[PDB]
Amino acid sequence: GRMHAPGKGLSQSALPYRRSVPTWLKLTSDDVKEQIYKLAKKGLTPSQIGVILRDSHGVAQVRFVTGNKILRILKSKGLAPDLPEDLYHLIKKAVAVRKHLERNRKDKDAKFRLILIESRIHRLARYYKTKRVLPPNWKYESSTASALVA
Amino acid sequence: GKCRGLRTARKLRSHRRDQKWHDKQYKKAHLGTALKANPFGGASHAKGIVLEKVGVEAKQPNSAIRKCVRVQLIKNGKKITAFVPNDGCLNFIEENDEVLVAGFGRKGHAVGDIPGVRFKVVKVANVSLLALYKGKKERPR
Amino acid sequence: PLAKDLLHPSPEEEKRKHKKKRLVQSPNSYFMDVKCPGCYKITTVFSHAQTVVLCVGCSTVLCQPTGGKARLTEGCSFRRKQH
Amino acid sequence: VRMNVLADALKSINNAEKRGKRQVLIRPCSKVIVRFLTVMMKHGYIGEFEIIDDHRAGKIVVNLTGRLNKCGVISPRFDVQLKDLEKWQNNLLPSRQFGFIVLTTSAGIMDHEEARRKHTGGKILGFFF
RNA sequence: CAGCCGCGGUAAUUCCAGCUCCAAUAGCGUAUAUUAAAGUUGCUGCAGUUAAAAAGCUCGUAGUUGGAUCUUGGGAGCGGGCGUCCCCGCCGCCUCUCGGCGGGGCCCGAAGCGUUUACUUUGAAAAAAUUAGAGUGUUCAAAGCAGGCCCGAGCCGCCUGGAUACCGCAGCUAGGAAUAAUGGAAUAGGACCGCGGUUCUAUUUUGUUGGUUUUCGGAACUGAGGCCAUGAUUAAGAGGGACGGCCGGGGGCAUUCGUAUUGCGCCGCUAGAGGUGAAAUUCUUGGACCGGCGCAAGACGGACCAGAGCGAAAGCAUUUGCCAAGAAUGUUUUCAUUAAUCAAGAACGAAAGUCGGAGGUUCGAAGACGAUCAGAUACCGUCGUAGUUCCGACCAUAAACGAUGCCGACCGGCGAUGCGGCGGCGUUAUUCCCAUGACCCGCCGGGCAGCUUCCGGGAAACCAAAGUCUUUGGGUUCCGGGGGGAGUAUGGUUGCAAAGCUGAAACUUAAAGGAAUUGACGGAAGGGCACCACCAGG
RNA sequence: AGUCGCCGUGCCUACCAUGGUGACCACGGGUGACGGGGAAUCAGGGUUCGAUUCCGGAGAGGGAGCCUGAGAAACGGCUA
Ligand SMILES: [Mg+2]
Ligand SMILES: [Mg+2]
Ligand SMILES: [Mg+2]
Ligand SMILES: [Mg+2]
Ligand SMILES: [Mg+2]
Ligand SMILES: [Mg+2]
Ligand SMILES: [Mg+2]
Ligand SMILES: [Mg+2]
Ligand SMILES: [Mg+2]
Ligand SMILES: [Mg+2]
Ligand SMILES: [Mg+2]
Ligand SMILES: [Mg+2]
Ligand SMILES: [Mg+2]
Ligand SMILES: [Mg+2]
Ligand SMILES: [Mg+2]
Ligand SMILES: [Mg+2]
Ligand SMILES: [Mg+2]
Ligand SMILES: [Mg+2]
Ligand SMILES: [Mg+2]
Ligand SMILES: [Mg+2]
Ligand SMILES: [Mg+2]
Ligand SMILES: [Mg+2]
Ligand SMILES: [Mg+2]
Ligand SMILES: [Mg+2]
Ligand SMILES: [Mg+2]
Ligand SMILES: [Mg+2]
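Output (structure tokens, whole complex):
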């Protein structure tokens, strides 16, 4: 596997077969959506939201206690960010490397790694653009988009 | 490996086309180079005129003289060498005798122990040299 | 080797396999309940927690993460009795 | 990648049975296999099979009684036209007695004999003997 | 003479002739195209470690190929050897908004006629002659469509025939719905005499009349409501991203350290020192080589260094600090098929080499000398230019080799090693008992390799992949077709030049080649042997 | 929008617009190229030929233009 690399790892998770709720948790979904909303004000991704609940409150899967996903929940309220998480971080990482590269213009591994990254991006947007999340004319320009990130 | 899809036909049909030219016989035939360079215009036999009579030497392990002739054609004008198969038969040929020649049997390739001959004489003066040998006829003096 | 049963493997045998490569998948983690002697609360935590939990009083810390399972503060007892 | 779910299983049936095993496990556990296995079992070439369920592709187990020589697959799924059976079946099979080419068709999954007794053709999947 | 191998050099099974025999037979040889043989152009159906052959590595558009999943039974009318396995209608849905077999029936063309196809089965419609083929004793046959009967011959006539099939692909018509693709309700929508209402309003009624709303239909538009179990398939031992602790001669910039070498200064004692198979060229009382204390400059990073690690490959080794990336593991986090391979095109690419600056210890193509030699414009020795070093741009080749494309599954064991995670007797640890390695003992993942075997293959050598291949089909890319001419000539293209990429033909030739075997040979190695060998001697 | 044409059409003329084809191979060039029904070989799949008695097309020394006629740019009709 590893679309742009030679590895063949299999490190990943394994949900159980019992989808039920384990009856020691005495916490209700209405209270869950509240805590989600709080954690969404302070600017946290869906994944950061899920790990916290699992670590410190006793929630494995929102989809079982609730019936919906985290992203659908926010978008019912109107708090989902403009861009998606995946595309966001790739754009962040690129901007750092190029900045690093503006000075140390004799590092070819970085160039090579850069071209890999941008290739990963143009694929991903072709999904979101077909799937009708991004407009038909959104594009990554590589001279802007330092400003989208931060 | 091999392509092997259900809608791959253009590729395969193409691949066989450009890759067939790497066969010697097909390439020879379907290009005009061997054809326009053959003294016979895609033909079996041909008449022509004698202008010399020479003797060609043979290959190493044999040793002999094979009694050939320099011959000019009527239609094309080109020049060639030709062989006279039988014992004592060169004497049956005079100068400027209007002979008929043919191939030998290998389709452009040289045969045997003769260095560079691929034509044999058949008829001199229209009286079928083989018959003349056997004494079934004589020449038209 | 020429004859076995795969439907009914030994429990010790299916236990010593990778999560997926078992006959059926199975998770390898648990939740547990902590005591915090300086308190009288019982907060519950995941094994491979990859976070730092502060107490209810914001007085103390319980788990510092690691590449695998977490740790405890060497004075804090856990009850691995869930379900 | 595993662009085909049926190709791999029959290979992993064939190899094991070619060795001398008594049971095997084949993973992805899809619908079309189940029909394919049912019709083999029905004619008698194998025993029973138990199909494990999970909330995924699933899994499955078979019992062999290895009186089988080869199990085969033909891909791409060609299109038969009911006059070409003879030309397919003479140059895939060992004889005119036994061996079955299995094909999907509008009526279902069946062997070639039943297709001719119902007078319909379809698309080809594989073969066994 | 001889298509090929080959025959003829005074006893020719092969030439010139005679007897004899062989094959086809009113026909038989010869030349040239063209089919089969050719599984030597390979869809069915080749090959690619060493025989000819996988681009140096990576990305990437068109192309080709793509995971799992949504009505199954049990029955019913039946026919064979309560029943049981194989046979035949059904448990295609209604459509009445309508057609016509003031209101009641039971059915059809329409209205979905089938969300849209592909698929398969049927039917239509295909110019004849030709082909397969039915009938007919043309004197048989090839052909051809004719022919046969009772009978004084009367019967002024009778029977007859002039079949059938195939006709790829597109196009037409009707049935079946597995397989493959697509569509539908997510900033809500289907249905309800639905209910209000703002409009046009065609003839139904106002008998015929003059005009309006009028109940009428169907238009655009706007308002409030009850109803649906009210609407989102799961989350791949497919993938992307997040998070945590680590890992490593991975990459760039600056920085400190080391012995050695070469030169220079000063001190000390003394005639040789170098280098060779042996010599000389050369350095040498104007003090060499040796020893001693200092200084300078530029290169290189020993032993530790391993069938150990990292990187796409090229390739990577002193200390420290900084900068930005990454694999594997762990995960009851997240998105939900987003993917594999890839013409065109794009990045990187040892050494040599080219261009412009700085620098120049050591080594050293050219070049000059001294030796060996029949000769040496070489092997040896002494000197010594370009270059070897750094900064910035060109070129794009190698035995760039695992001489072995990438992805994915399956297929036998054993003991180790390196990273991460999980555990357990015990020893140390340290400073009083814990979490760090270290070992001790196992496990699990994905790695560089290794030993063993009738797994199985293969021309063999050999190989857990070069296997699962005449029992031939997992997906896809590039490339080969007797040997030379030849990676040549020419045309186009890049480049400062050198060169690179694409890439012929005439002609020539019957063998070139691969793996293994028996000899012979060897200025290759290990044991022995001889006065037609030696040593010592006559 | 019109002219010519037995009729539809950039077939032609004027005024406007700037479009049409292409790696699913246009464009250009070669053909010992008239096309098809068919012929040879043929396990199954294919390879090659088809000027040649049937259907359709083109031409009458090379080029162009016409009269008559229902019908011809005729050629055993005319004019250069
Ligand atoms: Mg890829
Ligand atoms: Mg041939
Ligand atoms: Mg054949
Ligand atoms: Mg071959
Ligand atoms: Mg050949
Ligand atoms: Mg075959
Ligand atoms: Mg080779
Ligand atoms: Mg599928
Ligand atoms: Mg390329
Ligand atoms: Mg270099
Ligand atoms: Mg250089
Ligand atoms: Mg320079
Ligand atoms: Mg020197
Ligand atoms: Mg090369
Ligand atoms: Mg190579
Ligand atoms: Mg091989
Ligand atoms: Mg094959
Ligand atoms: Mg060749
Ligand atoms: Mg070789
Ligand atoms: Mg012609
Ligand atoms: Mg013709
Ligand atoms: Mg004419
Ligand atoms: Mg003439
Ligand atoms: Mg004329
Ligand atoms: Mg005429
Ligand atoms: Mg005439």
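The CA atoms of residues 49 and 98 of chain B lie 5 Å apart.
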